[PDB]
Design a binder for this molecule. Sequence first.
Ligand SMILES: CC(C)CCC[C@@H](C)[C@H]1CC[C@H]2[C@@H]3CC=C4C[C@@H](OC(=O)CCC(=O)O)CC[C@]4(C)[C@H]3CC[C@]12C
Ligand code: ALF
Length: 1036
Amino acid sequence: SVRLSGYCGSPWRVIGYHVVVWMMAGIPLLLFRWKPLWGVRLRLRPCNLAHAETLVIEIWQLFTVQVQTEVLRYYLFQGQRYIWIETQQAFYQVSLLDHGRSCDDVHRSRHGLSLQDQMVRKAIYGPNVISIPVKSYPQLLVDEALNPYYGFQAFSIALWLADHYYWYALCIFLISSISICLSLYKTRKQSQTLRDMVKLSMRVCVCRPGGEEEWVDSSELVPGDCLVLPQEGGLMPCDAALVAGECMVNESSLTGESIPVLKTALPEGLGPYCAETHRRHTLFCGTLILQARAYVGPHVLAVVTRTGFCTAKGGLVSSILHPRPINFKFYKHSMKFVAALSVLALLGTIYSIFILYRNRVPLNEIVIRALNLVTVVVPPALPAAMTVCTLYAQSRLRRQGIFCIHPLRINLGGKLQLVCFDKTGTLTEDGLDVMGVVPLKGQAFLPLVPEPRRLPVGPLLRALATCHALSRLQDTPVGDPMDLKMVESTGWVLEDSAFGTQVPVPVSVLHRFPFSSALQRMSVVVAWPGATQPEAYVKGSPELVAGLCNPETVPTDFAQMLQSYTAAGYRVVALASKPLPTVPSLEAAQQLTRDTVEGDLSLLGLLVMRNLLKPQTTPVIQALRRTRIRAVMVTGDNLQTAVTVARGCGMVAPQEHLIIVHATHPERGQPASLEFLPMESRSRHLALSGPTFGIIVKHFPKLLPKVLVQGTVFARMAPEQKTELVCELQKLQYCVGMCGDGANDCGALKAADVGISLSQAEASVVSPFTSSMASIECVPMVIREGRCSLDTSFSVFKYMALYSLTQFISVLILYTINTNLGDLQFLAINLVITTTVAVLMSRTGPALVLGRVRPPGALLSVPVLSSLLLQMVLVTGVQLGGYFLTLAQPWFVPLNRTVAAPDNLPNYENTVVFSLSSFQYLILAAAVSKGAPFRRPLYTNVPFLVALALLSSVLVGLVLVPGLLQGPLALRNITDTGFKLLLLGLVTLNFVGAFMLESVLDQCLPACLRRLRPKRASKKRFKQLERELAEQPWPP
Ligand SMILES: CC(C)CCC[C@@H](C)[C@H]1CC[C@H]2[C@@H]3CC=C4C[C@@H](OC(=O)CCC(=O)O)CC[C@]4(C)[C@H]3CC[C@]12C
Ligand code: ALF
């Protein structure tokens, strides 16, 4: 639901709010950006909605929009207009102003729209542009640099500069600048992609009232305006309803289907016009009209219906710009994790205050010594690391051909638990391939002929090459893909309609009755030179055609062969012929009725057509089902063809039962009945239909979960029932992700948590993901990279936690002995080592196989916290060992406690602690990068391995080479070399210890975790249903 609230303006309250927020503190601003309702309530006085100058749109989410005027007083929410309807005293969207007008009104608006009315409709409906907002670089900076994170970073910069650590402040400024430039680049790239995608502006002629055709801009169209389409065609500027002629629209930009479409005129009547009912008569926005022709009148007319964000492209782009929140939260208990790690920072700050009180430090300096130690545990390179993870994920995906528009969907692509599929184009080849035609020799069937070219010239070959409705569109046949394929198999070329022999007289079409879905058959009138009389060829459903055929012509084995072909996934169409005593001429042929031609036929043969399975589909389905990711087929084809594809493409192993569930329609006096009829060739599937699924949704919402938990084949599903089913599967807490390609799928590719549009261009609005390949090989390529990304994010968070705690423990061990870490040593640690490593750690790709082990989803998980705590105990052990070992050395002399750093610094203690700590960082960085089973191993991204090698070598130089950078960094020059080798031995001990500890945890700890307290039950609803079914199977 939503809610509105008016806030009539007043300047005194506004200026009071501004001065209070600016003078008081940033904390009120922080709680405001966390609780904006209180902030907006304090800013301005509530008022009646008819007096508003500011709204509060709610979805509960909070948005603030401004009511503006031009009386017309309107506001734009998410780009959709809403206007002030005076009579109803409410804000009604503009998509609902004229919504509900009849086709007769659309036809009446054919004469156009007068300029005096066009100005009114342009005031109401606004400009006909999908205006992606343009934000200047200052606006972007105010967007990102006002984050409380960067506010705290600037506070820390000032805090350090007030301590004369200039180089560390420069370091923090440079890292925050890099983070801001990265965020700005990401945002600008997304906005540039969208603004490039939806940029169209042209000049289109407009039908003025009275017939004075006027040319105007494409940004000055209004619903109700009449638009004349160029005879040669062109890009379409706005949705429209055809009111004359036919069109050839290439709707790939809107629905991802590149095949030309026939768009006929609008059928008259008093039925209110619908964008879905009359979807054959509507020309959408952004679709490239190939060629349009006018049958009556000199020009083809379209009456605009939707302009701007109201259109189909406008709606999809409003969805892309303002995506709905993601339901599955990737980092669960992340706040509790950072709290369980901030308790450590608080304990350390207590120790700091205590030991600096004990060290007789000035209180004004104790406050700084504590605030610095607090700001150490806030890593300046956290946003940089996160956005670099997302950028690397996007780039790895784009490098294969998968084009993710907004990168936050990859993490969802990682934890997929269900994957739906189309069938035609996704699993099986897009176009039907004919297996051949079986001819008749008297009253018996002849062996199947794979090549119709080898058929001798006769009624069968002529029917194959002529009985169709193909038309040449720009020197290219267009029409039904089935008919086009059955034509190209014969080798004949279209030249009324005449056809030339492949290698044998041309064949002419005297008359043709168009195919009808209700009649499920079609007939034509065919004549050729040298023929005594024209012949009629009929193609349609074989059982219906055979009825019209002569009983003595139909073989007695017709039914058995038909059953054997149809149940095998083939699509068989019957071809029949009959002589016509009509004189060969176009005049008499045009008078033939369809009823006369259809009757009294002679069966020529059966044309068998197969839809082959792509070679890349079976391995993908097997590698999705051996990783326990359910695979479902949501198709709109037959149920037997779907079942045969699914059983062939690995969705149903030969030993898994598939129980076709059938729901009989509830007649008068009886309810709906579920009857289960199985099939003869996890452990049980169900193959619903479209009507059966609708019946089970309506009547039996109790037996619906046990149908969506084990149902595999969903055939005869209407384009809206695919979305129905995807939503119903999400209601069982599946992370379903659909992978379809055509125009039927684009309804569900939005509802699915990860939609992949199989065959696309560089990008499109149809679905979050796309792809530039034809096979479903891109579903594993998305799941693998989603797992790699969802694991890289955990690795980077863990490294930032470990690297902050290590630096904080180091600074504490130094504060205890009354030293600090210096000025250039902080710069080294937080820029050269840690930022480099954190931004190169995310570069290593995904694994090359899909594993049965799903990545974690919790940051507070006891593996993660046990790892952090054990790594930190080991690091603190190594640093305290180094310190307590530099004491026992003979050449040791303690520092001057009478002064604090950087005065007493350099000294031996700071030298030892920094030397160990700078290695601690690289060791934890290589210890948290775990390749198996999600990522490719560490050495397989040469930037990271070379970074680790160069930094380890440089630090070993610092430890071993005298005078090497020991002046700028202020490291005391240790003369002894045996103690240097002892420090390196302690470093290597920590290296081995960290790697061994991580291996021991990752291997053994899960077993003890299972044994100590096994999971009693799973929160997933589908998991509870799966257990309930394994205990007792539902369909008996
Ligand atoms: C002073 C020194 C020692 C600090 C080192 C910092 C660099 C190692 C970091 C800072 C930001 C990082 C960059 C941040 C983000 C990107 C992601 C990536 O960009 C793309 O994905 C290409 C986009 C496209 O072509 O579509 C390439 C690496 C790069 C520039 C990173 C490379 C390493 C950079 C330059
Ligand atoms: F086979 Al489809 F939508 F392409 F069901």
